A paper describes a structure:
First, we used the human Gαi3Q204L construct, and recombinant Gαi3Q204L was incubated with GTP prior to complexation with TRPC5 to maintain the constitutively active conformation of Gαi322. Third, to facilitate membrane-associated interactions of the myristoylated Gαi3Q204L with the channel, we reconstituted purified TRPC5 into lipid nanodiscs. Each protomer of TRPC5 can bind one Gαi3 protein; therefore, a maximum of four Gαi3 subunits can be occupied in a tetrameric TRPC5. Among those, the complex with four Gαi3 proteins showed the highest resolution of 3.54 Å when processed with C4 symmetry. Remarkably, the Gαi3 proteins bound to the ankyrin repeat edge of the channel, which was ~50 Å below the inner borderline of the lipid nanodiscs, and the solvent-accessible contact surface between TRPC5 and Gαi3 was approximately 690 Å2. The conformation of Gαi3 in our structure showed a typical GTP-bound form, i.e., the α2 helix was well-ordered and adopted a parallel orientation to the α3 helix, which was also supported by the distinct GTP-like density at the nucleotide-binding site of Gαi3. We observed that three TRPC5 residues (Ile57, Tyr58, and Tyr59; hereafter the IYY motif) appeared to contribute significantly to the binding. Even after extensive 3D classifications and particle sorting according to the numbers of bound Gαi3 proteins, the four molecules of Gαi3 from the fully occupied TRPC5-Gαi3 complex (hereafter, TRPC5Class1-Gαi3) showed lower local resolution. In contrast, we observed substantial structural changes in the cytosolic domains, including the CCD and the ARD, when TRPC5Class2-Gαi3 was superimposed with TRPC5Class1-Gαi3. First, when viewed at the bottom of the channel, the CCD was rotated by 45° in a counterclockwise direction in TRPC5Class1-Gαi3.
Residue numbers in the entry:
A (entry chain D): 517 to 645
B (entry chain A), C (entry chain C): 16 to 273, 286 to 665, 705 to 753
D (entry chain D): 195 to 273, 286 to 323
E (entry chain D): 710 to 753
Write the structure that this text describes.
Amino acid sequence: ILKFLFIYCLVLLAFANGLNQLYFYYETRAIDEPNNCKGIRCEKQNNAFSTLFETLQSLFWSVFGLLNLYVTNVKARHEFTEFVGATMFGTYNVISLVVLLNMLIAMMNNSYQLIADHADIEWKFARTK
Amino acid sequence: DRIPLQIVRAETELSAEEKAFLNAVEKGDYATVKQALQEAEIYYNVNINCMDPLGRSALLIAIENENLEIMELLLNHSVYVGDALLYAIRKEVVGAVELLLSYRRPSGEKQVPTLMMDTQFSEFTPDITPIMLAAHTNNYEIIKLLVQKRVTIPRPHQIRCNCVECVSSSEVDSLRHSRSRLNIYKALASPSLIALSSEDPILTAFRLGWELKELSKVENEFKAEYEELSQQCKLFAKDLLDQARSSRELEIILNHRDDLAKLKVAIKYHQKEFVAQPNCQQLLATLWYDGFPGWRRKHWVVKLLTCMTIGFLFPMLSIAYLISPRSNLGLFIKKPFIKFICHTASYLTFLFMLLLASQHIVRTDLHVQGPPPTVVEWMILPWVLGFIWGEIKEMWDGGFTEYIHDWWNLMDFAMNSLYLATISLKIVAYVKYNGSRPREEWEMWHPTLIAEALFAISNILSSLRLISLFTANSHLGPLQISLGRMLLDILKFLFIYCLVLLAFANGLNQLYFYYETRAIDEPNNCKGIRCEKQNNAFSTLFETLQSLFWSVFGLLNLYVTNVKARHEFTEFVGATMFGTYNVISLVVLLNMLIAMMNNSYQLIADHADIEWKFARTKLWMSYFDEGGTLPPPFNIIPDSLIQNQHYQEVIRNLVKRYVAAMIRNSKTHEGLTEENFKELKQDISSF
Amino acid sequence: DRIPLQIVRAETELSAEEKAFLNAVEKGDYATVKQALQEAEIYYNVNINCMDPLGRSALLIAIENENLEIMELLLNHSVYVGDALLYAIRKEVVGAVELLLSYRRPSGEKQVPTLMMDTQFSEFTPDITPIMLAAHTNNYEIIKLLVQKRVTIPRPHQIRCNCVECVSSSEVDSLRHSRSRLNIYKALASPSLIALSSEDPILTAFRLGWELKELSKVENEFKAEYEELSQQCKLFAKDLLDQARSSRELEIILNHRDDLAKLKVAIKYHQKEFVAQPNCQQLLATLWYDGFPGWRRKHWVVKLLTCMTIGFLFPMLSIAYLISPRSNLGLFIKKPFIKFICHTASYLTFLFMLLLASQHIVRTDLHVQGPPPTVVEWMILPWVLGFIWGEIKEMWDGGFTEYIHDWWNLMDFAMNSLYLATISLKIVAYVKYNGSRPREEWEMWHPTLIAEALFAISNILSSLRLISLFTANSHLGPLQISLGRMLLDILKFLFIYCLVLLAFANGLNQLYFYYETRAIDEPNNCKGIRCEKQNNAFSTLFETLQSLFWSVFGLLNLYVTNVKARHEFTEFVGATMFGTYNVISLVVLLNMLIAMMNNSYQLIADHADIEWKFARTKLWMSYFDEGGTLPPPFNIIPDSLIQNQHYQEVIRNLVKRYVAAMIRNSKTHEGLTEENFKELKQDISSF
Amino acid sequence: SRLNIYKALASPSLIALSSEDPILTAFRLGWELKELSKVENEFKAEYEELSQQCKLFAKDLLDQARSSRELEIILNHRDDLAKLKVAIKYHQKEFVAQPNCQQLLATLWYDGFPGWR
Amino acid sequence: NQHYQEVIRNLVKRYVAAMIRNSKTHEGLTEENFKELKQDISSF
Ligand SMILES: CC(C)CCC[C@@H](C)[C@H]1CC[C@H]2[C@@H]3CC=C4C[C@@H](OC(=O)CCC(=O)O)CC[C@]4(C)[C@H]3CC[C@]12C
Ligand SMILES: CC(C)CCC[C@@H](C)[C@H]1CC[C@H]2[C@@H]3CC=C4C[C@@H](OC(=O)CCC(=O)O)CC[C@]4(C)[C@H]3CC[C@]12C
Ligand SMILES: [Ca+2]
Ligand SMILES: [Ca+2]
Ligand SMILES: [Zn+2]
Ligand SMILES: [Zn+2]
């Protein structure tokens, strides 16, 4: 798992940098937004790619599906920028949920198959210790 | 009910005298055969060339029983000698093959006795010459004896051959042509024939391995045999390299030319076993850590701190090479490890500055139409030009036929195209979009927005370029090799997934685009799946494709299949379509992809060490040359006969060591038992 | 720097005369030994019991070289004969063991010659008697020869033994006790000793297999050896059954008593290989399809239609058994297949009526506090009472110690408890809740609502009871066997998952329950995660457990970690806790569970045929008896010596066939080669 | 030369003949060969095979015991269970998980509760 | 130390016996038998 999260952290940093670089012009204040809140932890999901920390949080939470789709929508009608941001978000989702997670599944299943033969000796060694 | 059993294909039954003669031959009695041969000459009782039903002849049975005196008497009395040499060669006995080779010319008088109908059965195909079968059996002594008698093998043609004789032979009889080519390549790929009849066994093994791999790619039917022959050639080259005993022999082998020329040839021919041999890896490690002796013995703290300071000294030690290449400080950059660390530090600095360009400290006054570049972008532009010049230099040096085989140069080309695009869009927006119009009323297709979008995509590609540095580490190399194989499996899967997605998107759009609504009628003046309330999702083909893509991750809600009017049947049919697509793409296809990459990971995990070492060698030798010494921020700032004699002297010892290492590992239980039984029988008979 | 190599444990070096004597012994010369033995008697030059450093003696070397005349001369001249019988037995030669057995009593005069310090080395432990080692080697002739001479083996005690001698021997020397018990059980589990010294080899094999499995469960250290011995006993029983040649022998074996008594014994001892043997399966299939000959040869359409009509004739043919058991129609229910189909049809009718009870056609006037039962429920009540009476009858017959081992009776007990609970709640709500109060103002703890909830849970259990019918089919049997094993793996996983869930729920509740709000302040007067707007999710331990359970399936939103005030640090820490729990429970633990059940499926897929056949046999023999003929809607409506002689006659032929089938498959390449070499050497020496 | 020397020193017969403490010698050579396998990248398989050979030699030499007194003499020998602590320190998993050592450790663990199994 | 060396003597000698008897294989026994047969035939 640690060997996998090295690559996942690299990919997450890359896509968070790309999304934040595209999107932080459209940051809004908490007063203009409803309920005086700003972030992805609101009832209506506010600006999610306005800071590097907020982009990292949003791209982390998007793996479990708790990040909605309308976070890639801006106030003005910049359809090309919205489409490019949605393409970036979709590519990150495809990687982190179709490639990387299934590779992690295959990796730990292979390692479980190698470790299941010697599962008796090391358990007895740990119990003796 | 009594199924009748009868010999439906009845051979001619042997005569009683013939049965007695071959029974005497297989008995091994020397005295009884001679009276039979004299009476067959005089009285013509026994045809000497008779044939028992299980495919054997008296000479041929004497070959199997390896008795030489019965051989000599029979062949003195003129048995048909043809096709018997192949059985002796397959028997792998020196005495029989020497006896039939020696007595091919017994001062033959009146040509040969006539024969009719006895060249019916031969276990070997007519294209098999004795040298080819000797190479197939891979026995050193028989091959040497045959080669000493001036024998030849036909040369196979090119794979892409269109001459008259190859086309005519393939058209008339394709099976004979394929068998002949496979037999010729089996004869040429034997280690003994390469060790005996080629002056450069390593280069010959490399070329035959590459040719057999290409034939395996072309010829679909004999793929397994050609792959086995290529593997045999590769392991022969690896063993011949492995028989070395000193570093001087290893560096004579590797540096031999027609610096490391033979290693470059081996990499060009994809010889992974030759490259990943431990002594070659040790020599490459000693060349890689040129200025840092004992790098493996250091504690990781001082290794890490040395890397820390030599990475942080990246603006220095590169201008020193510019101002004084011959100084003690100037020569310290020419070593490959310092080159690699300086390039890595330069790329990390580039990524850090692209990270810093996305902050509010630098970015000011966003409400200008065409903005002048900020001080961060003015400083960035030399690294972009350095990457451009480095990729241009890599495109000229080495050739266009080698620049495209790396498969990382496509990513660099996309990076360069995006950087040129964003530079061009910024300069055109500077020169002819003067103004300060606020961003809320800009054109969708404003070139500033296109420039920023392409800049963001180039940022992602630049930050994802760091995958290629994983072979330098000892833990992330085989991991990305498995990534590379399973990515091909992913592409094979997305072919089927794209077909299914296109089918269901067409079906949903065909059902649903009547109920498209305008953006004015819908709340918040928005139209699409990227709204707070998910609007019409199946109203255009592009929108249907987007919705069916986003439905895999669960970000598409269920009420997108609901229309304004109360058409319950149409809504139910659309929901059924959406449910069927979800069942396929989330229960069938994804789990099949899981099983596919897990199976491929299980096959690739056995060889995860050799290909990682091959990739690490290919990365190491990229820094050995002097072309590309400077980092990207600074690269734009303005006798052969003696070597042949030594190589042949080394190859003599290596080949002789390898042939000794084969014979002693070739004597097995069965052959030793057969030799002991034959010796015991001979001693008992003589006594 | 010259590591000194020296013999640090130096044996006493042999004398030159001793070296000559043992060299003459290993040479095999008969003449040279005799003068040495006479001179050792007269001149006392050679100690006959001397010991070369590699653990051998002159008699013992003569044992390894299997020469009998040197044996006879040495043992005539009084070599120490002890411990040599074990080496002869391990040599597996009849002549040597017969010679040492015969000359144990050479009319011994003046006891034995004295010996000091030569019982130092024995390759065999002192607890090994010759019969035990003969059983260990598993050779028929040596075992027979030893048994013919009145030999005994000690009886092992019970596993749960607490007598004085077992406790004292375990306390003083546990290793010797464990080795002795393992050696005794290895001697008793050999097929030859069971075939020779037990009058009921099948029952003895069953009992020893069960005892060895129980010892493997108890003794942790020798689990592999005891499991191997149990497997050896099971395969011996399977082979002895497999050596049958006729149906009369098979039905004599299966029906032998101390109807199918031995099959019931085999099922009780969990002999899966004995039960799933093909001829026993054929006999059970012929008994199962008693009234339908040629059921396997029919096309599936007529088989399906026959099942269709005999399932639809379920109310008939059961009352016919009540009114006329001796009629032609009355006897047709006693066959097992018709019993199984009628029980399945009754259960399907019960499930269909529970489905029909949930419709608006029957249910009327929901606004009564205590409703009288409707006509559907009045009709249902006899099936519930029939299930009760059937489970009561199954609890008495067979015993309480067998009713709990099925593991399906827990589900039936839960079903029965729920049915009694809902019946009691309905009758109490009838008798003392008279009224017509509307449902919107009922008490939370109203017994009518509790009755309906328990009725729904009983409905789910009744409909999920259909899993147990999967062994009757040929495709769903091994599938649910794999389900059964992987469910145990699931329980092993949910132990760790429950621990992690409890930890993170405690952490979140400890952080968050200050900010609990009342239901009045929150919108729609609701409080919990089951609202339209997700309310406080970490305000109680139960609510935190529910929220962290529902977060695995993604049904818990992200804004549950937001509080009313602007405590950004507390919100961030809670979001970090929630994210860490999500990472664990969805990236680590679930994928580990995937890998675990995939690995267990790979191990269980090899044996998926035997255990399915065992489960199908256990289901088939449940319908063979006459107890439980009627369906649940109708079950409440008011000489031994001749058999022993035949069994022993069959066992004689079976055991003799099995021992012949072992010796011919016991002659191997190595033994035949050794015998041929010994015969050739003997013939050459004699000539 | 180094690989040949370590192959010569790791043979069971030479340890049994030329070392007065075969168990401790097997432990130390196994640890040294494992450390050499960690350091030397090229001969990792050979050094790991030699370390495994030393570990199984120590396990077999322990397994050739015949009585509890011999086992407790072996385990409690010093230069209480000193040799078991040494084996754990050298990561000898096959030596520790041998069944008779596990039985002795189980009897020491259930000191006041006889017949716990 | 004396008791330990006394135990190691028996353990090492048992282990070396357990190797030689499991070291005699089919091929070595066949080679020895063939050599003995050839020597006996030549001597006779
Ligand atoms: C974990 C998160 C914060 C992302 C980090 C991204 C980068 C800062 C990492 C990812 C890949 C790393 C590289 C992976 C492997 C190596 C090889 C490593 O050298 C060796 O392994 C020694 C042997 C040799 O290569 O000769 C030196 C560090 C370096 C360049 C690493 C430098 C730091 C990199 C670029
Ligand atoms: C697919 C959906 C609609 C759920 C259906 C549930 C039931 C109607 C099914 C599930 C399990 C089925 C049973 C599975 C296996 C069998 C055995 C089958 O008989 C055989 O396989 C012949 C050999 C033999 O058992 O002797 C007869 C039908 C039956 C009872 C099936 C009857 C129909 C059942 C109860
Ligand atoms: Ca490049
Ligand atoms: Ca029951
Ligand atoms: Zn041609
Ligand atoms: Zn007792």
